[PDB]
Design an enzyme around this catalytic site. Structure first.
Site, PDB file in Angstrom:
ATOM      1  N   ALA A 180       4.000   1.810   0.486  1.00 30.82           N
ATOM      2  CA  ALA A 180       5.217   1.793   1.312  1.00 30.82           C
ATOM      3  C   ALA A 180       6.505   1.441   0.559  1.00 30.82           C
ATOM      4  O   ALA A 180       7.591   1.911   0.917  1.00 30.82           O
ATOM      5  CB  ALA A 180       5.035   0.868   2.510  1.00 30.82           C
ATOM      6  N   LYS A 230       8.778  -3.564  -9.575  1.00 27.28           N
ATOM      7  CA  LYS A 230       8.747  -2.132  -9.278  1.00 27.28           C
ATOM      8  C   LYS A 230       8.837  -1.281 -10.544  1.00 27.28           C
ATOM      9  O   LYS A 230       9.783  -1.409 -11.322  1.00 27.28           O
ATOM     10  CB  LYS A 230       9.850  -1.748  -8.284  1.00 27.28           C
ATOM     11  CG  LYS A 230       9.841  -0.262  -7.909  1.00 27.28           C
ATOM     12  CD  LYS A 230      10.513   0.013  -6.568  1.00 27.28           C
ATOM     13  CE  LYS A 230      12.020   0.048  -6.680  1.00 27.28           C
ATOM     14  NZ  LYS A 230      12.640   0.692  -5.474  1.00 27.28           N
ATOM     15  N   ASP A 279      16.859  -1.974  -0.274  1.00 31.21           N
ATOM     16  CA  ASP A 279      17.065  -0.506  -0.225  1.00 31.21           C
ATOM     17  C   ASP A 279      18.479   0.015   0.094  1.00 31.21           C
ATOM     18  O   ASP A 279      18.630   1.143   0.579  1.00 31.21           O
ATOM     19  CB  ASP A 279      16.060   0.152   0.733  1.00 31.21           C
ATOM     20  CG  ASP A 279      14.629   0.061   0.245  1.00 31.21           C
ATOM     21  OD1 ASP A 279      13.726  -0.003   1.104  1.00 31.21           O
ATOM     22  OD2 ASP A 279      14.399   0.062  -0.986  1.00 31.21           O
ATOM     23  N   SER A 297       0.803  -1.234   0.000  1.00 28.40           N
ATOM     24  CA  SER A 297       0.000   0.000   0.000  1.00 28.40           C
ATOM     25  C   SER A 297       0.836   1.284   0.000  1.00 28.40           C
ATOM     26  O   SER A 297       0.731   2.116   0.908  1.00 28.40           O
ATOM     27  CB  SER A 297      -1.051  -0.006   1.123  1.00 28.40           C
ATOM     28  OG  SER A 297      -0.521  -0.491   2.345  1.00 28.40           O
TER      29      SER A 297
HETATM   30  C1  LIG Z   1       9.782  -6.283   1.828  1.00 34.19           C
HETATM   31  C2  LIG Z   1       8.290  -7.235   1.572  1.00 34.19           C
HETATM   32  C3  LIG Z   1       7.421  -7.421   2.649  1.00 34.19           C
HETATM   33  C4  LIG Z   1       6.246  -8.150   2.487  1.00 34.19           C
HETATM   34  C5  LIG Z   1       5.942  -8.699   1.244  1.00 34.19           C
HETATM   35  C6  LIG Z   1       6.812  -8.511   0.169  1.00 34.19           C
HETATM   36  C7  LIG Z   1       7.987  -7.775   0.327  1.00 34.19           C
HETATM   37  C8  LIG Z   1       8.889  -7.615  -0.857  1.00 34.19           C
HETATM   38  N1  LIG Z   1       9.431  -8.633  -1.569  1.00 34.19           N
HETATM   39  N2  LIG Z   1      10.222  -8.126  -2.622  1.00 34.19           N
HETATM   40  C9  LIG Z   1      10.172  -6.782  -2.566  1.00 34.19           C
HETATM   41  N3  LIG Z   1      10.787  -5.900  -3.384  1.00 34.19           N
HETATM   42  C10 LIG Z   1      10.597  -4.573  -3.143  1.00 34.19           C
HETATM   43  O1  LIG Z   1      11.206  -3.647  -3.953  1.00 34.19           O
HETATM   44  C11 LIG Z   1      11.882  -4.046  -5.086  1.00 34.19           C
HETATM   45  C12 LIG Z   1      13.277  -4.002  -5.122  1.00 34.19           C
HETATM   46  C13 LIG Z   1      13.965  -4.404  -6.269  1.00 34.19           C
HETATM   47  C14 LIG Z   1      13.249  -4.853  -7.381  1.00 34.19           C
HETATM   48  F1  LIG Z   1      13.894  -5.259  -8.487  1.00 34.19           F
HETATM   49  C15 LIG Z   1      11.857  -4.905  -7.344  1.00 34.19           C
HETATM   50  C16 LIG Z   1      11.178  -4.505  -6.197  1.00 34.19           C
HETATM   51  F2  LIG Z   1       9.838  -4.559  -6.174  1.00 34.19           F
HETATM   52  N4  LIG Z   1       9.814  -4.152  -2.107  1.00 34.19           N
HETATM   53  C17 LIG Z   1       9.193  -5.016  -1.283  1.00 34.19           C
HETATM   54  C18 LIG Z   1       9.377  -6.376  -1.519  1.00 34.19           C
END
Ligand SMILES: Cc1ccccc1-c1n[nH]c2nc(Oc3ccc(F)cc3F)ncc12
Length: 339
Positions: free
Chosen positions: A31, A50, A159, A29
């Protein structure tokens, strides 16, 4: 060969992705940014996609930076790149960047644990950090929310590499080393080790270690635990203004960590004492921490790999928007999926 792309409105933007990616659904959502969960029919992996990027010089450079960082990271405990694509057929129509990684289960917030669980989670963070630091990359913002696990508690760091969101009673600041929180000096890689100390403590107690109501309240919380700085550290604080303020504080000795972390594994207490040192020059490194007795059952010097060299000369480079954009395009086009 170029895959077939299909279009779909998701996060009030039109997402155009290769057919291989199915069942796209927004997650977090907001974040995580504009991120969708999907099923990759090519690999059988649940993935996070992303969608980002060339609005200004700062934005274009940041886009290039993120792609460069993600393309470099190839480690079990670090978020890496499964895929990167653009629907654009040429540099001229290139205006969108999609990044694909593993879909994780939960972050460390949605987990906070036995001493055995803490050992395993901190081990993995440190294993990932050894890798990241070996490439001369600093995370700078390690916190429970950018540490994610699957069902088997296997962990990956996300990150790596505003004033308002860092203000007040906020988790965004609770894990930051004092030298970076207060801009004391040109900082090193052990800013990340401070963060690990904060996280580890919280895993052990279930409570934030330094839940400061603002920068100053947080500094006071920190100094009550680890003591006020001595002459040697004061000299290293290049910020004359910051050094001046520190000396105004009533001196305090370092507390007994065994009385703070009541009932905890004495080896955990020992490690915390080595991570939560005010002088960053004297903090334990990731490589050193991995060899600490606390991780005896997980430590394997032959299974804790380092990174290939990472060329970040681009960071000191000034370029035009279209130049950063061209560099980014080259990186997208040259991407090779992991074996
Ligand atoms: C941190 C989390 C918590 C709960 C459920 C899923 C996730 C999660 N899994 N993978 C995740 N990737 C991201 O950012 C990216 C980072 C690099 C990418 F190539 C693509 C992305 F989408 N952000 C949250 C999650």
């Amino acid at each position: 060969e170029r895959p077939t792309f299909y279009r779909q409105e998701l996060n009030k933007t039109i997402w155009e992705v290769p057919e291989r990616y199915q069942n796209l659904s927004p997650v977090g959502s907001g974040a995580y940014g504009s991120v969708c969960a999907a099923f990759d029919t090519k690999t059988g992996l649940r993935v996070a996609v992303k969608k980002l990027p060339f609005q200004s010089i700062i934005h274009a450079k940041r886009t290039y930076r993120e792609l460069r960082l993600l393309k470099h990271m190839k480690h079990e405990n670090v978020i890496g790149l499964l895929d990167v694509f653009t629907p654009a057929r040429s540099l001229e129509e290139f205006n969108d960047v999609y990044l694909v990684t593993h879909l994780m289960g939960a972050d460390l917030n949605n987990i906070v644990l036995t001493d055995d669980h803490v050992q395993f989670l901190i081990y993995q963070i440190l294993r990932g950090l050894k890798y990241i630091h070996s490439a001369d990359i600093i995370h700078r913002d390690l916190k429970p929310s950018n540490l994610a696990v699957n069902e088997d508690c296997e962990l990956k760091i996300l990150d790596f590499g505003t004033d308002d969101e860092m203000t007040g009673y906020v988790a965004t600041r609770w894990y930051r080393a004092p030298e970076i929180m207060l801009n004391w000096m040109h900082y090193n890689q052990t800013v990340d080790i401070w963060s690990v100390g904060c996280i580890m403590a919280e895993l052990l107690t279930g409570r934030t270690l330094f839940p400061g109501t603002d920068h100053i309240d947080q500094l006071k919380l920190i100094l009550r635990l680890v003591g006020t700085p001595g002459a040697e550290l004061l000299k290293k604080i290049s910020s004359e203004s910051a050094r001046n303020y520190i000396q105004s504080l009533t001196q305090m000795p370092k507390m007994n960590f065994a009385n703070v972390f009541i009932g905890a594994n004495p080896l955990a207490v020992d490690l915390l004492e080595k991570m939560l040192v005010l002088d960053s020059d004297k903090r334990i490194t990731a490589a050193q921490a991995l060899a600490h007795a606390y991780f005896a059952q997980y430590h394997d010097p032959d299974d804790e790999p380092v990174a290939d060299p990472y060329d970040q000369s681009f960071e000191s480079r000034d370029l035009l928007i279209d130049e950063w954009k061209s560099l980014t395009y080259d990186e997208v086009i040259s991407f090779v999926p992991p074996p």
